[PDB]
Design a protein around this ligand. Structure first.
Ligand code: BCL
Ligand code: BCL
Ligand code: BCL
Ligand code: BCL
Ligand SMILES: CC[C@H]1c2cc3[nH]c4c(c3C)C(=O)[C@H](C(=O)OC)c4c3nc(cc4[nH]c(cc(n2)[C@@H]1C)c(C(C)=O)c4C)[C@@H](C)[C@@H]3CCC(=O)OC/C=C(\C)CCC[C@H](C)CCC[C@H](C)CCCC(C)C
Ligand SMILES: CC[C@H]1c2cc3[nH]c4c(c3C)C(=O)[C@H](C(=O)OC)c4c3nc(cc4[nH]c(cc(n2)[C@@H]1C)c(C(C)=O)c4C)[C@@H](C)[C@@H]3CCC(=O)OC/C=C(\C)CCC[C@H](C)CCC[C@H](C)CCCC(C)C
Ligand SMILES: COC1=C(OC)C(=O)C(C/C=C(\C)CC/C=C(\C)CC/C=C(\C)CC/C=C(\C)CC/C=C(\C)CC/C=C(\C)CC/C=C(\C)CC/C=C(\C)CC/C=C(\C)CCC=C(C)C)=C(C)C1=O
Ligand SMILES: COC(C)(C)C/C=C/C(C)=C/C=C/C(C)=C/C=C/C(C)=C/C=C\C=C(C)\C=C\C=C(/C)CC/C=C(\C)CCC=C(C)C
Ligand SMILES: COC1=C(OC)C(=O)C(C/C=C(\C)CCC=C(C)C)=C(C)C1=O
Ligand SMILES: CCCCCCCCCCCC[N+](C)(C)[O-]
Ligand SMILES: CCCCCCCCCCCC[N+](C)(C)[O-]
Ligand SMILES: CCCCCCCCCCCC[N+](C)(C)[O-]
Ligand SMILES: CCCCCCCCCCCC[N+](C)(C)[O-]
Ligand SMILES: CCCCCCCCCCCC[N+](C)(C)[O-]
Ligand SMILES: CCCCCCCCCCCC[N+](C)(C)[O-]
Ligand SMILES: [Fe+3]
Lengths: 281, 302, 240
């Protein structure tokens, strides 16, 4: 039940709510007030999903789907079997996610580390909330939110995207994708670099960070360094999610036509709008 | 406000660092570039040196030729008019030969010939650049992980521009060179293959792409959270575990009930990332060669 | 069909990969232990991998993992409950004993070395010709703790030669001796360096280094552990 070095760190303290009341573990899992909150929110949410499954009339995980209130309900309540369960499951999900972050904070305080992890997680929660809470509210109905189902959430992505034509043309989406791709590139390179240094050619001694800097300077003329790369991966991946939430919060609110047409502002600039030739004259 | 180690408070500099020598041919290294104080708030201030060498020159020249072959075509499409070139920059497109030319090199310059020449230059640029990731690790006595990982990106690229077109029987299947046209190509590829969302390899690829952001957010944030105990000195934490690596592991053990090591996190990392393009390239390679319509295939569960 | 085969193969490959990855990640800290240090009955479903050996540079030896785990230091904690899973209370002063958030690991009592075999971390004064290149220079600034009292003054920066970065501030105390404070645990301001982790009276208790121009992995762990530990244990004297 304990890692070999673990005991020295399992002291009292660090909780945000309840003093020592929930200051303990279960196997490897820290508990805390927010561990109790997470369990409660998650347990309810799962039970409601199973109830939703019964009212839909299936137990196949590829078929279970919990749909938000139809558009006619606006931002009000709905009968449970017609959107209300979705509404409650969503409160449960949010409670669980926020609880999970706050429990992470408690672990941080006990361990004497920085809060960077729950802070980064909060970006993911904010993206979820953009799709199920902020965007639906700004747009006037719960029904614009995605449904909770494995394949049905994908139908939603598709239908939402095609509502605006090829969603590729959302410029905030373009920035988002760039961050995603760049992040995966950086992850591949960080992983490969450290490993290539820790596991050198057969019989050779472990390389050093100097070799890591040297390899990258040789390769491309720059190295961000070992603090830099962990700053980078954090930045790239949080920026991707930031721009993801941006690209959706502005869709169906400030912009709601075909995203391809947005790009006409550049082509129609007076100085060149009317010069013939090229693609657009 | 506690200091968060996102940006440095104080930069320091000393003699330009010329790097480790090992077996590198030193005749092929530039001198150091300038130092960027701007960069230095976030990473290293030093630029260069860089390694030239014959493979390096080849790859660079070839990559430029690719870039310039597309750009000349763009100027041509613009009727040599600077203002139209800028106006229409994202709209230009160097397109591959029409279906009727099959896999032959007999299409005219203006209808595919130029695309083939650009592609040829891209091919040698990328492969010789791959050779470089291998050789720079070799000269330093390092493992080959970088070249192995690059090979996974190269796989999707090769599939899209070369392997899949050859299997389909024509260059017209490849991707055009253009900002907007490549996006239209992407949208159209999905539409024509009955929606990529039904390709299990596309879904896997997404799981990994998202998974990379999840993982790098986790790792990046963890290292920073333990940088007050020297966390980012990963290689020496591998060789001689410190309290940084232990607090890291325990954060995760307490949160989600398992954890990594200082070396092993980097193995999760490399694989989360390369599997994006490994599953990706498979999903594309199967598209139209074996499976015409992912929705249809999915209805037969296969 | 070929796509069916590929997808089925992929899931098998991925099960094997997760297996490989999880076992690779058990090269440290395993086997699991009870709170008393003995092997736990339940090790889980993953077995330890075959050992691997890292060759350390500069004649520092090798590391083989997995291998026999031990703390190599006394842990001043005691049970607070009669069953597994509860916190372990400090038996003395947790800051001085190095437990909880003040923990340190028994790392090699040698300095980390660069690729040339030189000490990786040096006071700037002994590092040719390193100087502050941007940002406020902390050298000379009074150093303040979370009790808003002055604990001493910055007399140097300890820098990482190969990576050209600031790692510690060397701080001089009322009695003329110095301590290292981790760079990540200070706030450089225009008229002061502020340290939220420690009240002024806890500065004397920072673990000292044995040679004035080098610091060992062991010493770094004790310094960083002790300063972090103040977040929790200096809380009664804070104050912001
Ligand atoms: C994966 C499925 C599709 C496709 C779908 C998408 C989608 C969807 C998007 C992109 C976007 C990008 N794609 Mg694409 N992309 C594919 C094929 C690729 C290939 C290739 C196979 O060689 C290339 C070069 C590009 C590159 C481009 C970039 C223009 C852009 C940012 C990528 C990035 O952050 O990379 C990693 C970052 C780097 C460090 C290197 C990349 C730097 C860029 C600037 C170089 C690319 C080409 C360069 C010549 C552009 C110059 C611009 C002007 C001419 C001055 N794509 C395939 C065919 N691509 C995004 C975009 O913004 O489009 C406009 C976007 O939303
Ligand atoms: C045909 C469909 C359209 C499309 C329509 C849309 C639509 C619509 C959307 C996107 C969005 C996304 N698209 Mg798109 N877009 C398409 C083409 C692409 C292409 C491509 C190569 O062609 C790419 C790369 C992308 C990429 C992007 C990303 C920027 C973004 C998704 C990531 C995200 O928001 O994460 C953010 C992360 C989350 C939301 C996850 C949060 C999870 C946390 C908080 C909780 C989960 C925990 C719990 C349930 C787990 C259980 C516990 C267990 C123990 C595990 N799109 C085509 C053109 N795109 C989406 C977006 O930006 O959303 C903001 C979006 O809504
Ligand atoms: C982010 C932008 C879009 C969207 C875009 C798409 C697209 C496009 C795809 C997915 C796919 C996935 N999406 Mg989705 N997805 C949305 C947001 C959600 C949310 C949420 C906010 O709560 C969740 C939990 C999921 C989760 C799912 C998974 C079923 C699947 C793999 C994702 C992954 O590996 O992530 C990376 C994170 C990890 C690797 C951590 C692992 C955690 C995963 C496995 C959690 C599974 C939980 C799931 C079974 C929910 C049950 C929870 C229980 C009731 C407790 N999506 C929004 C609406 N998603 C892919 C798929 O194949 O679907 C069929 C796919 O192609
Ligand atoms: C309407 C569009 C379709 C769709 C059609 C496509 C198509 C088509 C493809 C993808 C592909 C992917 N899609 Mg999709 N996609 C859709 C919906 C989405 C959504 C969503 C709806 O939220 C998401 C998140 C994604 C996610 C993604 C990625 C997982 C995946 C490509 C990963 C990658 O890293 O490639 C980026 C990396 C590369 C392209 C490799 C780079 C190779 C190197 C060698 C290039 C170097 C070039 C160098 C010379 C340039 C130098 C210039 C610099 C300035 C130096 N898709 C919808 C259903 N998608 C790709 C895939 O694999 O699918 C299975 C793909 O071909
Ligand atoms: C912001 C950058 C990226 C990121 C960061 C991030 N994610 C994080 C964290 C961070 C730093 C963690 O600290 C935390 C973690 O503990 O990781 C292991 C986490 C986490 N991210 C997770 C998933 C996840 N993150 C995602 C993405 C991202 N996370 C971004 C790409 C995605 C995507 C891309 O879809 C997924 C699916 C979990 C592994 C974990 C959070 C675990 C958690 O909050 O648990 C508490 C609650 C439960 C145990 C389940 C509650 C169940 C609900 C009550 C009911 C389910 C409702 C749901 C809405 C239905 C969805 C159905 C689907 C078919 C759509
Ligand atoms: C594992 C999946 C991810 C991945 C990984 C990956 N990519 C790789 C590698 C890895 C491991 C590297 O080793 C390799 C690399 O060297 O990275 C630094 C690389 C790389 N991936 C790159 C880009 C890239 N990767 C892609 C993404 C991905 N790669 C996936 C997300 C994408 C996307 C998402 O579309 C892009 C665009 C390059 C940075 C690099 C490959 C470099 C290359 O093949 O070069 C050949 C061509 C040239 C040498 C020059 C090209 C011409 C330029 C247009 C000219 C402009 C600048 C010029 C150099 C100025 C010179 C001026 C002179 C006159 C002085
Ligand atoms: C160098 O450092 C680093 C480490 O360390 C040395 C690390 O470990 C890690 C951590 C990273 C890994 C171990 C890599 C592998 C992880 C991923 C690929 C991320 C995806 C994660 C999953 C697939 C697992 C998600 C499962 C979860 C979140 C746990 C589910 C548990 C439950 C049973 C939930 C129910 C409620 C609970 C547990 C609340 C507590 C209360 C009670 C039990 C009551 C990182 C980032 C790091 O950089
Ligand atoms: C300012 O003006 C100048 C001229 C100075 C500079 C301007 C230049 C400009 C504007 C260039 C713009 C470049 C752009 C927009 C390029 C964008 C391209 C994109 C987005 C690429 C995306 C897909 C690329 C793929 C998938 C291509 C892969 C290619 C291969 C796999 C090569 C296959 C090899 C072939 C077909 C040749 C076979 C030959 C043999 C025998 C090996
Ligand atoms: C611990 O090692 C790490 C660093 O520190 C020595 C890095 O320097 C880099 C290299 C990152 C850079 C500079 C990428 C910039 C270049 C392009 C073309 C995107 C990686 C991957 C890394 O893991
Ligand atoms: C794909 C990334 C390529 C990066 C290449 C950077 C080019 C810099 C060239 C420097 C020129 C060297 N020299 C000796 C002539 O000065
Ligand atoms: C992807 C990052 C690319 C950065 C390229 C930086 C090139 C620096 C090369 C140094 C050469 C400078 N010079 C003229 C002194 O030789
Ligand atoms: C991604 C690399 C680009 C780095 C440029 C960002 C510069 C930010 C400067 C931070 C400000 C430093 N300051 C004043 C607080 O000391
Ligand atoms: C490095 C290993 C991490 C494992 C990631 C787990 C991905 C599961 C997502 C399921 C994808 C669903 N589908 C049908 C598209 O294959
Ligand atoms: C893809 C998600 C599947 C859920 C399982 C995730 C792994 C959690 C670790 C299991 C913990 C078991 N333990 C340590 C209490 O025995
Ligand atoms: C997609 C990643 C799947 C994560 C699950 C992998 C391991 C889960 C739990 C590992 C067991 C921990 N244990 C018992 C060895 O301590
Ligand atoms: Fe790392």
């Amino acid at each position: 039940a304990l890692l070999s070095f673990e005991r020295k760190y399992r002291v009292p303290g660090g909780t945000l709510v309840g003093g020592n009341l929930f200051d303990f573990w279960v196997g490897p899992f820290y508990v805390g007030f927010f561990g109790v909150a997470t369990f409660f929110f998650a347990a309810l949410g799962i039970i409601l999903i199973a109830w939703s499954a019964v009212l839909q009339g299936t137990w196949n995980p590829q078929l279970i789907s919990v749909y938000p209130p139809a558009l006619e309900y606006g931002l009000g309540g709905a009968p449970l079997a017609k959107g209300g369960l979705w509404q409650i499951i969503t409160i449960c999900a949010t409670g669980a996610f926020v609880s999970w972050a706050l429990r992470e904070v408690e672990i941080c305080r006990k361990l004497g580390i920085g809060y960077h992890i729950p802070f980064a997680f909060a970006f993911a929660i904010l993206a979820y909330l953009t799709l199920v809470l902020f965007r639906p509210v700004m747009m006037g109905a719960w029904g614009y939110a995605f449904p909770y189902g494995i394949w049905t959430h994908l139908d939603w992505v598709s239908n939402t995207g095609y509502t605006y034509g090829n969603f590729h043309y959302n410029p905030a989406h373009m920035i988002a994708i760039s961050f995603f791709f760049t992040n995966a590139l950086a992850l591949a390179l960080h992983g490969a670099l450290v490993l290539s240094a820790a596991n050198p050619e057969k019989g050779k001694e472990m390389r050093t960070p100097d070799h890591e800097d040297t390899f990258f300077r040789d390769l491309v003329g720059y190295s961000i360094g070992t603090l830099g790369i962990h700053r980078l991966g954090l930045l790239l991946s949080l920026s991707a999610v930031f721009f993801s939430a941006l690209c959706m919060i502005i869709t169906g609110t400030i912009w709601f036509d075909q995203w391809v047409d947005w790009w006409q502002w550049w082509v129609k600039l007076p100085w060149w709008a009317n010069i013939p030739g090229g693609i657009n004259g | 406000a506690e200091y968060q180690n996102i940006f440095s408070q104080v930069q320091v500099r000393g003699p330009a660092d010329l790097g480790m020598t090992e077996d590198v041919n030193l005749a092929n290294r530039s001198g150091v570039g300038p130092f960027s104080t701007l960069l230095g708030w976030f990473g290293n201030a030093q630029l260069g040196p860089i390694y030239l060498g014959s493979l390096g020159v080849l790859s660079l020249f070839s990559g430029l030729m690719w870039f310039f072959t597309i750009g000349i075509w763009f100027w041509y499409q613009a009727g040599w008019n600077p203002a139209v070139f800028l106006r229409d920059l994202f709209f230009f497109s160097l397109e591959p030969p029409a279906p009727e030319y099959g896999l032959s090199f007999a299409a005219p310059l203006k209808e595919g010939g130029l695309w083939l020449i650009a592609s040829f230059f891209m091919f040698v640029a990328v492969w010789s650049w791959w050779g470089r990731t291998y050789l720079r690790a070799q000269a330093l006595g390092m493992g080959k992980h970088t070249a192995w990982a690059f090979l996974s990106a190269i796989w999707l690229w090769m599939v899209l521009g070369f392997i899949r077109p050859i299997l389909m029987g024509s260059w017209s299947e490849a991707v055009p060179y253009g900002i907007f046209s490549h996006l239209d190509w992407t949208n159209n590829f999905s539409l024509v293959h009955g929606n990529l969302f039904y390709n299990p390899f596309h879904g896997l690829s997404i799981a990994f792409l998202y998974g990379s952001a999840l993982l790098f957010a986790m790792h990046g944030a963890t290292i920073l959270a333990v940088s007050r105990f020297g966390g980012e000195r990963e290689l020496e934490q591998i060789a001689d575990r410190g309290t940084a690596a232990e607090r890291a592991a325990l954060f995760w053990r307490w949160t989600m009930g398992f954890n990594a090591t200082m070396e092993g996190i980097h193995r999760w990392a490399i694989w989360m990332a390369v599997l994006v393009t490994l599953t990706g390239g498979i999903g594309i390679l199967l598209s139209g060669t074996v499976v015409d319509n992912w929705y249809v295939w999915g209805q037969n569960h296969g | 069909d070929l796509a069916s085969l590929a997808i089925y193969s992929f899931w098998i490959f991925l099960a094997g990969l997760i297996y490989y990855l999880q076992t690779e990640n058990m090269r440290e800290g395993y086997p699991l232990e009870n709170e008393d240090g003995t092997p736990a009955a339940n090790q889980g479903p993953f077995p330890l991998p075959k050992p691997k050996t890292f060759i350390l540079p500069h004649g520092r030896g090798t590391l083989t993992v997995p291998g026999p785990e031990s703390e190599d230091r006394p842990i001043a904690l005691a049970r607070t409950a009669v069953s597994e899973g509860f916190p372990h209370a400090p038996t003395g002063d947790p800051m001085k004993d190095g437990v909880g958030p003040a923990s340190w690991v028994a790392r090699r009592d040698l300095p980390e070395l660069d690729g040339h075999g030189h000490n990786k971390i040096k006071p700037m004064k002994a590092a040719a010709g390193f100087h502050v290149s941007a940002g406020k220079n902390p050298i000379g600034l009074p150093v303040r703790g979370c009790d808003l009292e002055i604990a001493g003054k910055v007399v140097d920066i300890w820098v990482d030669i190969p990576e050209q970065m600031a790692r510690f501030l060397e701080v001089e105390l009322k009695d003329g001796s110095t301590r290292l404070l981790p760079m990540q645990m200070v706030k450089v301001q225009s008229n002061r360096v502020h340290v939220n982790a420690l009240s002024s009276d806890l500065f004397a208790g920072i673990p000292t280094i044995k040679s004035p121009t080098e610091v060992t992995l062991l010493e770094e762990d004790k310094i960083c552990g002790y300063v972090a530990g103040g977040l929790m244990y200096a809380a009664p004297k804070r104050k912001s």
